[PDB]
Amino acid sequence: PISADFSEVENAPSFLSLAENTDEVLKPYTGLEIQTIITNIVGDANPNQSRIFDQDRLRGNQYSAGGLVTQNAVSAIPFTNLIPRTIRVGNILVNSANRLQITETNVSEYYSNPIIATKLSEMISDQVKNNQFSTWRRDNTSLQGFNAFDIATINTAILPNGLSLESMLLKLSLLHSIKAMNVDAASINRSQYQVIDHNTVPTIGAPAVVGVNNSPVFGEDCGGNNPVYPFGGGTGAIAFHVTLQTVPDERKSYAIFVPPAILQATSDANEALALFALSMSEWPHALYTVTKQTTDLAGANAGQQVFIPTQSTIHIGGRRVLDLIIPRREIAPNPTTLVAANAMCMVRPQAGPDATAGAIPLAAGQLFNMNFIGAPAFEEWPMTSYLYSWAGRFDITTIRQYMGRLATMVGVKDAYWAAHELNVALSQVAPKMTTAAGGWAAQAANSAQQSDVCYSSLLTVTRSAANFPLANQPAADMRVYDTDPATWNKVALGLATAANLVPEQSMDVPFVVGDARASFWERLQAIPMCIAWTMYYHSRGITTLAWDNAYTDNTNKWLQKMVRNTFSTTQSVGTIIPARYGKIVCNLYKNMFHRAPAYVATSVGGKELHITHFERWLPGGTYANVYSGAGAVVNCFSPVLIPDIWCQYFTAKLPLFAGAFPPAQGQNSTKGFNSKQGLMIHRNQNNNLVAPYLEKFADNSSYFPVGQGPEINDMATWNGRLWMTTGNVQYLDYSGAAIVEAVPPAGELPVGKQIPLLAGENAPIELTNAATTCVPRYSNDGRRIFTYLTTAQSVIPVQACNRAANLARSCWLLSNVYAEPALQALGDEVEDAFDTLTNSSFLDVAKSVAES
Amino acid sequence: PISADFSEVENAPSFLSLAENTDEVLKPYTGLEIQTIITNIVGDANPNQSRIFDQDRLRGNQYSAGGLVTQNAVSAIPFTNLIPRTIRVGNILVNSANRLQITETNVSEYYSNPIIATKLSEMISDQVKNNQFSTWRRDNTSLQGFNAFDIATINTAILPNGLSLESMLLKLSLLHSIKAMNVDAASINRSQYQVIDHNTVPTIGAPAVVGVNNSPVFGEDCGGNNPVYPFGGGTGAIAFHVTLQTVPDERKSYAIFVPPAILQATSDANEALALFALSMSEWPHALYTVTKQTTDLAGANAGQQVFIPTQSTIHIGGRRVLDLIIPRREIAPNPTTLVAANAMCMVRPQAGPDATAGAIPLAAGQLFNMNFIGAPAFEEWPMTSYLYSWAGRFDITTIRQYMGRLATMVGVKDAYWAAHELNVALSQVAPKMTTAAGGWAAQAANSAQQSDVCYSSLLTVTRSAANFPLANQPAADMRVYDTDPATWNKVALGLATAANLVPEQSMDVPFVVGDARASFWERLQAIPMCIAWTMYYHSRGITTLAWDNAYTDNTNKWLQKMVRNTFSTTQSVGTIIPARYGKIVCNLYKNMFHRAPAYVATSVGGKELHITHFERWLPGGTYANVYSGAGAVVNCFSPVLIPDIWCQYFTAKLPLFAGAFPPAQGQNSTKGFNSKQGLMIHRNQNNNLVAPYLEKFADNSSYFPVGQGPEINDMATWNGRLWMTTGNVQYLDYSGAAIVEAVPPAGELPVGKQIPLLAGENAPIELTNAATTCVPRYSNDGRRIFTYLTTAQSVIPVQACNRAANLARSCWLLSNVYAEPAVEDAFDTLTNSSFLDVAKSVAESAGEVPATKALTDLQAVDVSSLPSTSDPSNVLSQPAPLMSPPT
Amino acid sequence: DNSSYFPVGQGPEINDMATWNGRLWMTTGNVQYLDYSGAAIVEAVPPAGELPVGKQIPLLAGENAPIELTNAATTCVPRYSNDGRRIFTYLTTAQSVIPVQACNRAANLARSCWLLSNVYAEPAVEDAFDTLTNSSFLDVAKS
Incomplete structure (x- = not known):
């Protein structure tokens, strides 16, 4: 919450209080309620537009430190999934000079929830014991x-492990998010097309077109018609079978059975089949491309423009080749000829509508020739091309059917919400901030700095180093559980069950999937995640260089344990x-929002535990930093991506050091903290340093x-923000000598990204869009960092900490915050009669919210 | 501790009291015990802030026997790991004339803790037995x-030995000791560069540069950019694999699986692969080189001076060719083509940032082409060059992180601390002492005597006799345990466990790893080792020549048993x-320092015995002696290597014979022992000898x-010291005849090494920096040794033994303090409970999974036929499990 | 700190022990009178290692002049600079080791002294005529 007065910031909770464990169960924090914070907003200059195309932004009135009011000022929504591949320069589209972002992942195995045998299996093994299965016929x-x-x-087979469904559903949801872009332009907000390329204006007239392997540069095409994994x-390879007898040896151990339930999932059984195949093979198989018409900021130069979805570049799985066993619709003995095998199947597998080339070309709609016990030759198809054929026909409504069928076969609720959490945590992405004295700034067009970007986790993302197909040394980001084929087959056929395998109604499938607003909701869910990480990296003053070197090159033991304990480790x-x-970090999330992250079962030696996306990152990454104008790296600050107003206006509660400044010119305007609480000043007046x-x-x-290392103390961090928000802070050490870290040009602070304005909107003023909370305290060398002012510059702020003066800072006039007159002619304290008439009806709301 | 009055020396503990075995448990000797005394530091502090570059001396006021007081007197720290490779002569840097020191190890399998199969392997065997009812090839x-x-x-087919992990951890600690040198000069002592070359002065302004295969002399660049084994x-050869089936049949029995618990980092994983490859092959793979800027005593001349670390010279024989089996990225059929193999790697191996020449040249960053089924040509690399390319990139903080990931699979705390003890025992080294009247001496620059050196055990280090690579091999100096690849493979995957292999709740390593202060501490841990060995040798009167020939001597039979039981040559x-x-010696260390040496276990029929580094030396070396001012050897003394102030100022308890001479205090000064102690004066036919x-x-x-042989008596040894400490003694026979052994020029005693002074320092005076406790008693040919004075020179000392008179001796002006053996973060307090239960669960994690036998049983055709039902697992009996018992 | x-x-507090260590630092012949950061203070400082000493007078035969620091003020340990800075007494590290261990009572410092004992006296006449007249004096004095 933003503060209307300084009493509101004195009474804010400590960081330690919020990091404390909370025991109660909490609800998921969907974008369907995050949505309403952007809409339904104070301010009269605002034209409260209905289309979600235009609800893309944070609008509001502002108040200057000099006492002036500014109407309908603007702050951009930081995240996106799109990556530009054509860049406007000089008002025209021009081919991009920067390489594509890439993500990578490691598999793990799932011993939690071991399976239980059904009565069916137990009676079958019983029959194996009393007989030799000799009772059965050739054709039963x-x-x-x-x-x-x-x-x-x-x-x-006897299996130790449970069953997971995670990697499966994750691939399904990544594809879902890519297909969700195909809806009409009114249904997707335009800010998503200009977070990186800020010289470009999407047109509302036509929907984006989703294709594959159409990229302009860097081998991105992936060989075009002959598709090779990126x-x-x-x-790869794919084959079809009526029996596991026909699958070749050294592959018999890896075969998947396709239940008839997958085949009756949708109106076209081949589509459901290909969807299952894509779901259980390696991802990505190809690189999808979003094309959207755009125009010049003057509107002069329209044209089509290419974007690469972030979901398309994440690397998961490794199963290049597979065999699928298909139901036989007739009661027959195993086929000996080709035609018998063709007639025998429940539905014969087929190629998709879009034809491909290669050494084994596939004509559109081509029918597969089934394998049989006679083997003049084994028969097979290329797998990337088989998926290239069906790539255009996948669609979010059909995916909604498919999920309903799965929900009926086994519960998909919990697992899909967790997979969706991982999808958000991996695909949503924001550009690195640039520094300024004023309200807005951005890096040069088609610059390398323009394209540097980061996770909600504030880890910078890896960039490709060479043309596709890649032959890189992998640099994985996080671990994920894998879905096991044998454990799959035991369950697909009624041979086993588990505690998390309970069947569900189709009605209970989570509402995001198949909805056209989902893209928008995606972005929204990125915002709270960052806030939590932001509060973790800020409570301690550690600089970005110190985070870049703790795991790889620093002799201080404390950073080593520090970077080590923030990430997960393997068991024997x-x-x-x-x-x-x-x-x-999880605790923070639940105290600031009163909502919970998804939980997933985990075990240590036969002991239950949980895991969230917060606890499954890998150590060894590089951190977010900021750029000076002209693009020089600066790294004095603790890492930062998003402006304070985002952290301040979405939380139900925030720690004291992060509160918003009260408006200028009131009684109880911004202040500071002094000795009585427990603080002490450092002076260096021999060198003009206070x-x-x-x-x-x-x-x-x-x-x-x-x-x-430095202790958590909210009030000193606050005073450090006060010294910083003054115009010319200087970052030196205990003696007043220069620190090793690179520093911003004097007076500059990191600030939010610029985007083109709608008519009637204004650029944000002063430090209204600045991030302020990231005050350095610990350097890579291990020395303390000090924020200094000169002895003259430092005289009023000392009196304000000492509470014998007020300070002046800019604010947002939102949510009960009003402007302050220069006079301040106070009267007797007086409750207004309208506030007494409406007091109860107002408290009822708060109580209703407290229930929730 | 230093005596203040004669009452304190007279009441000191007897030697037999301190050599009794003790029962109490004790904390490890971390070396901070000395740091509190010889330095400013009181609590944990930044090494750079402390300037421990200047904290490298014993310092203090001294009192003379004539009654003057010298202020700011100094004594050097005896040990170092650096061997100078260029030497200063005539104020000008020049090349070394002496060949390099070398060490050899014995490496063998031995019994450890008894081992047992985990629950998970019972699961695998159940899977095979249940498969046997089918026609299907997927066994487990x-x-x-x-x-x-x-x-x-x-x-x-598991081995009954257990597993050790010792040679592995040694190689890792040797390398940590070498890269530790690379930090800035403010955190390394000056004295470490001038223990041997006392004419050189290192500059504080630049960090030392560690490199590989650079040395100017005697062929010590082992191939250079075209590396070969020293x-x-x-x-060697090294080859990588996805499955065991591609490994050539000649060596499938030697292969090692690489666990994926390591390689989990976002970065530095290929480096982790190179490091793991280094920890299981032969050592050294190259000669490392420390290079430091230095200057002349006046500070005029300046240059880059070359040193060889001792850790890089000590040989630990291992495999030369090897085959590693890389973890697969996903369960899948084995690759039949190259691209399928390259795409399938979890971590794909590559060369480090340093090109090499020769056959199979390696470009920096070069990737490996994986072996696969049906491959036209087998691929592999030379290993010495692969380890060469990464050699310049390893550093302390990465070894710490690696070792921390390694910690979560297996116990590595105690094992590492023991291997670290062995590191310090084989690496810290001191130059031989010079005899003199005064407080300081040194041998001629660039001479054989200048570079002759010794272990903390008082044994000389052998030299090379020819240019590198060495055509032949030295006798082994010490025996270490080996690590078998088979049982390593079983344990890395979770198939087996033992009490020493259990993961520890700390989930963390010893404090020494990852610190820039490590070199200083290792330098300080050698001191107690010498104090205990010198007490051992000086309790008896045998001379260095008599030790030097003791093993084979047939003049006397006791001398043989004496030599034979000091080394490890028994098995059972x-x-x-x-x-x-x-x-x-182990008992002495515990009673004197109130600390416990690190130890490994050995199982004898299942009973556990402890073994410390004191008990594993091997016979064949030569004992330490001292040189004359001219460089002639002196044999007459017991072995000695350090001045006795080090012995007597850093102990909690000391044997009576070794104590300091008490300070003058009015009338009373020094005192002796007489016939009222049960002693007697010796006289011969000659009337002018006493x-x-x-x-x-x-x-x-x-x-x-x-x-x-001669008995322990502390008082007689005391009077022996009082006689020697007069400036005019005769070392003679019962009859007054000369002994066979070489004797020093008259009145001289061995004294500690000279180093250049800082402004305000004074050199040590008189006998304030000398070994004194080395009193000879056993001649090589079986004669007793006596110390004689003339009658007139005899009168005052005899009356002093009678306590009618007083002797005048120098002392340090120092007090006694011996410290007790002795951090939560706010985040740690936030998470302490969850850490406390999870750490408890990891201790039993083993090969455990939540599925029990009772669940898996339901999935079986026949429970009674399951090998887990008919063979529940047991810990193996030793040496062997019973086979074919008589019904 | x-x-x-x-x-x-x-301002600076009474501590007797800290003043003691301040004297022990000054009484070495090579001290630096400096700032928290090691910078020079505004006040004029003596040429290095010197302390104020008592006045010279000519000797009588058999007398000797006082030696070393046996005739000097020592107890004057500066702490409050004119411009409000604290004053510290600094040694170099190598010069620091023996004095620190002496504060720890592991080592010993060498100083001159007088060879003198302690005696402090208690705070302390009738004539025959006074005895003759003592009574009359006692009443008249009262009157």
């Missing part, structure tokens, strides 16, 4: 359409052990002792 | 993506046994009887 |  089959000898031989190159079996300090009231030193006044 | 689950047939072969002179029931008398009060048996032996 | 300038309304 179940109603499902598989013969008994196969079910019997599958039954004989990572590593090469084609190879299972995840969750990140130790990650549990803190620093705020700070924490009492503990033998760590100039160098921190090895094995210790 | 394929763990962590490795081929299921490979899990089937790894999960078979000892073998060959080159298939396993190594500790030296019988090394336990005495020897002190000595044990009564001394009157009835001139040759010791065969099967007997 | 938490002041380089004293806070307004506050």
Whole structure:
């Protein structure tokens, strides 16, 4: 919440109070309620437009430190999934000079929730014991359409593990988010097309067109008509079978059974089949491309423009080749000829509408020639091309059918929400901030700095180093669980069940999937996630250089344990052990929002535990920094991506050091903290250097002792923001000598990204769009960092900490915050009669919110 | 501790009191025990802030026997790991004339903790037995993506030895010791560069540069950019694999699976692969080189001076060729084509940022082409060059992170601390002492005597006799345990466990790893080791020549047993046994320092015995002696290497014979022991020779009887020191005849090394910096040794033994303090509970999974036929499990 | 540790032990009188290692002049600079080691002294005529 008065910031909660464990169960924080914070907003100059195309932005009145009012000023929504591949320069589209962003992932295995045998399997193994399965005929089959000898031989496997469904559903949701862009232009907000390329204006007239392997530069086409996997190159393989007898040896151990339930999932069984195949093979198989018409800022130069979705570049799985066992619609013995095998199947597999080339070309609608026990030759198709054919026909409504069918077969609720959380955490992305004295700034067009971007986690994303197909040394980001084929087959055929395998109604499928607003909701869910990480990296003053080197090159023990404990570690079996300090970040999320992140089961030796996306990042990354104008790297600050107003206006609660400044010219305007609470000033007047009231030193006044770092103290961080928000702060050390870290040109602070204005809107003024909360305290060398002013510049702010003066800072006039007159002729305290008439009806709302 | 009055020396503990074995548990000697005394630092502090560059001396006021007081007197720290490779002569840097020091190790399998199969392997065997009812080839689950047939072969025929992990951890700690040097000069002592070359002065302004294969002299660049082994002179081979089936049949029995618990980082994973490859091949793979800017004593001349670290010279024989099996990215059929193999790697191996020449040249960053089924040509690389390319990139903080990931699979705390103890025992080294009257001496620059050196055990280090690579091999100096690849494979995957292999709740390593302060501490841990070994040798009177020939001597029989039980050459029931008398030195260390040395276990029939580094030396080396001012050897003394102020100022308890001479205090100064202690003066036929009060048996032996030697007496040793400490002694026979052993020029005693002074310092005076406790008693040919004075020179010392008179001696002006053996972050307080339960669960994590036998049973055709039902797992008996018992 | 300038309304406290160590530092022949940061203070300082000493007078036969620091003020340990800075006494690290261990009572410092003992006296006449007249004096004095 933003503060109307300084009493509101004195009464704010401590960081430690919010990092404390909360025991109660909480609701998920959907974008369907995050949506309403952007709409339904104070301000009279606002033309409250209905279309979601225009609800893309944070609008509001503002108030200057000089006492002036500014109407309908603007702040952009920081995240996006699109990556530009054509860039406007000189009012025209021009081919991009920068390489594509890439993401990578490691598999894990799932011993949690071990399976339980059904009565069916137990009676079958019983029959194996009393007989030798000798009772059965050559042609006996179940109603499902598989013969008994196969079910019997599958039954004989014994499995330690549970079943997961995670990687599966994740691939389905990534594809969902890519297909969700195909709706009409009114249904997607235009700010998403200009977070990176800020010289470009999308047209509302036509929908974006989703294609594949159409990219202009850097080998992005992936060989075009002959499709090769973007990572590593090469084609896969896919084959179809009526029995597992026909699958070749050394592949018999890896075969998947396709239940008839997958085949009756949708109106076209081939589409459901290809969807299952894509769901259980390696991702990506190809690079999808979003094309959208755009025009010049003057409107002069319209044309089509290409974008590459962030979901398209994440790397998951490794199963290049696969075999699928298909139901037989008739009760028959295993086929000996080709025509018998063709007639035998429940529905014969077919190529999709879009034809492809290659050594094994596929004509559109081409029918597969089924395998049989006679083997003049084994028969097979290239897999990337088989998926290139069906790539255009996948659609969010059909995916909604498919999810309903899966929900009926096994519960998909919890698992899909968790997979959706991972989709948000991996695909949503924001550009690195540039520094300024004023309200708005951005990096040069088609510059390398324009395209640097980061996660909600504030880890910078990896960039490709060479033309596709890639032959890179991998640099993975996070671990994910994998879906096991044998454990799959035991469940697909009624041979086993688990505690998390309970069947559900189709009605219970989460509402995001198949909805056309989903893209928008995606962006929204990125905002709270950052806030939590932002509060973790700011409570301690560690600089970005110190975060870049703690894991790889620094002799201080405390940074080493610090970077080490923020991330997860492996168990002897190879299972995840969750990140130790990650549990803190989760707590923050639940105290600032009163909503919960998705939980996932995990085990250590046969002991239950949970895991969230907060606890599953890998150590060894590089961190967010900011750029000076002209693009020089600066890294004195603790890492930052998004402006304070975002952190301040969405939280139900924030820690004291992060509160908003009250408006200028009132009684109880911005102030500071002094000795009485417990602080002490450092002075250096021999060199014109004065620093705020700070924490009492503990033998760590100039160098921190090895094995210790700066303490959490909200009030000193606050005073440091006060010294910073004054015009010319200077970042030096205890003696007043220069620190090793690169520093901003004097007076500059990092600020939010510029976007083109709508008519009637204004650029934000002053530090209204600045990030202020990231005050440095700990350098890579281990020395303390000090914010200094000169002895003259420092005289009023000292009196304000001392509470014998007020300070003046800019604000947003939102949510009960009003402007302050220059006089301040106070009267007797007086409740207004309208506030007494409406007091109860007002409290009822708060109580109703407290219930929720 | 330093005596203040004669009452304190007279009441000091007897030697037999301190060599008794003790029962209490004790904390490790971390080396901060000395740091509190010889330095400013009181609490944890930045090494750069502290300038420990200047914290490298014993300092203090000294009192002279003539009654003057010298202020700011100094004594150097004896040990170092750096061997100068260019030397200053005539104020000008010049090349070394002396060949390099070398060490050799013995490496063998021995019994450790008993081992047992985990629950998970019982699961795998149940899977095979349940499969046997079918026609289907999929026998068991394929763990962590490795081929299921490979899990089937790894999960078979376990060895009863247990597993050690010692050689691995040694190689890692040697490398950590070498890269530790690379930090800035403000955190390394000046003295470390001038223990041997006392004429050079290192500059504080630049960090030392560590490199590989650079040395100017004697062929010590082992191939240079075309590397070869320093000892073998060959080159290795290294090959990477996805499955065991592609490994050539000649060496499938030697292969090592690489666990994926390491390689989990976003970065530095290929480097982790190179490092893991280094920890299981032969050492050294190259000669490392430390290069430091230095200047002349006046600070005029300046240059880059070359040094060889000792850690890079000590040989640990291992495999030369090797085959590693990389984790698969997803369960899948084995690759039949190259692209399928390259796409499938979890971490794809590559060369480090440093090009090499020769056959199979390696470009920086070069990627490896994976081996696969049906491949036209097998691929591999030379290993010495692969380890060469990464060699310049390794550093301390990465080794710490690696070792921390390694910590979560297996116990590595105690094992690492023991291997670190062995590091310090083989690496810290001191130059031999010079005899003199005064407080300081040194041998001529660039001479054989300048560079002759010794272990903390008082044994000289052998030199090379020819240019590198060495055509031949030295006798082994010490024996270490080896690490078997088979049982490593079983344990890395979770198939087996033992009490020493259990992961520890700290989930963390010893404090020494990852610190820039490590070199200083390692330098300080060698001191206690020498204090205990010198007490061992000086309790008895044997001379260096007599030790030097003791093993084979047939003049006397006791001398042979004495030499023979100080080394490790006994075994029983298939396993190594500790030296019988090394336990005495171990006992002495505990009673004197109130700390416990690190130890490994050995199982003897299942009983556990501890073994410290004291008990594992091997016979064959030469004992330390001292040189004359001219460089002639002196044999007459007991072995010695350090001045006795180091011994007597850093102990909690000290044997009586070794204490300091007490300070003058009015009338009373120094005092002796007489016939009222049970002693007797010795006289011979010659009337102008007198020897002190000595044990009564001394009157009835001139040759010791065969099967007997000189006894422990502390008081007689005391009077022996009082006689020697006069400036005019004779080292002679019962009859006054000359002994066979070489004796020093008259009145001289060995003294500690000279180093250049800082402004305000003074050199040590008189006998304030000398060994004194080395009193000879056993001649090489079996004669007793006596110390004689003339009659007139005899009168005051005898009355002083009678306590009628007083002797005048120098002392340090120092007090006694011996410290007690002794951080939560706010985040740690936030998370302490969850850490406390999860750490408890990891201790039992083993090969455990939540699925029980009771669940898996329901999935079986026949429970009674399950091998888990008919063979529940047991810990293996030792040396062997029972086979074919008589029904 | 938490002041380089004293806070307004506050100055250095009585501590006798800290003043003692201040004297032990000064009494070495090579001290630096400096700032928290090691910078020079505004006040004039003596040529290095010197301390104020008592006045010279001519000797009588058999007398000797006082030696070393046996005739000097030592107790004058500066702490409050004119411009509000604290004053510190600094040694170099190598010069620092023996004095620090002496504060720890592991080592010993060498100083001159007088060879003198302690005696402090208690705070302390009738004539025959006075005894003759004592009574009359006692009453008349009262009157």
